[PDB]
Amino acid sequence: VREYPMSNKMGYWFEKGKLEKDKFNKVLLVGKQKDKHWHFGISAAGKLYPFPVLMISSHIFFTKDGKELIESKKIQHAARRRQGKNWWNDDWRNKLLAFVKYLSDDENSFYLE
């Protein structure tokens, strides 16, 4: 997974072409917005309170031709704020769940070394 650094966390997204037809589980995870390519991204922070879980946060990353990241934080934020209007509750849920299911190693989980 291709990494994009945040201010105080670590984001992860798919380089265009890594997925089959750039989508998984019949849910598009990398797409196009006008001249830029939007990439669904996540950032993980594991917590032990209340109980051991891996809190995952949704993000949107933008690239020019699906290859390299736009180097303007303001441009990235502006592109996302507009792209966020389109997506809905179900749209975010499906994208998050499909993106996590890619991590799966066995049928019902995935292991961290």
Partner 1 sequence: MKELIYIHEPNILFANGQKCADPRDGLALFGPFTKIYGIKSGVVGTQYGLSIFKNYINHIQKPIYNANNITRPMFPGFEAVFGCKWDADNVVFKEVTKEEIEKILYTESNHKRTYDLVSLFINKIITANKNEDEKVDVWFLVIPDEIYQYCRAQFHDQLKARLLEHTIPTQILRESTLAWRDFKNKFGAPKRDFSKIEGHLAWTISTAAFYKAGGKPWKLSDIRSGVCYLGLVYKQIEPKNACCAAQMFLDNGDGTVFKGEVGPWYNQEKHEFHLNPKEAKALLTQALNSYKEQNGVFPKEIFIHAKTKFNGQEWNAFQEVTPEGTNLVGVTITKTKPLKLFKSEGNYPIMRGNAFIVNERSAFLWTVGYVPKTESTLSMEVPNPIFIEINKGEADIEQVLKDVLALTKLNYNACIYADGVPVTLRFADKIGEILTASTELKAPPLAFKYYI
Pick 56 or 66: Cβ nearer partner 1: 56
Candidates 17-25, 63-71, 90-98, 100-108; binding stretch for partner 1 (CB under 8 A)? 90-98
Q: Which of residues 37-56 bind partner 1 (CB under 8 A)?
A: 47, 49-50, 55
3-state secondary structure of 96: helix
Q: Which of 17, 46, 57, 82 binds partner 1 (CB under 8 A)?
A: 57
| Distance in angstroms (rounded) separating the CA atoms of residues 95 and 41 | 9
| Distance in angstroms (rounded) separating the CA atoms of residues 16 and 71 | 17
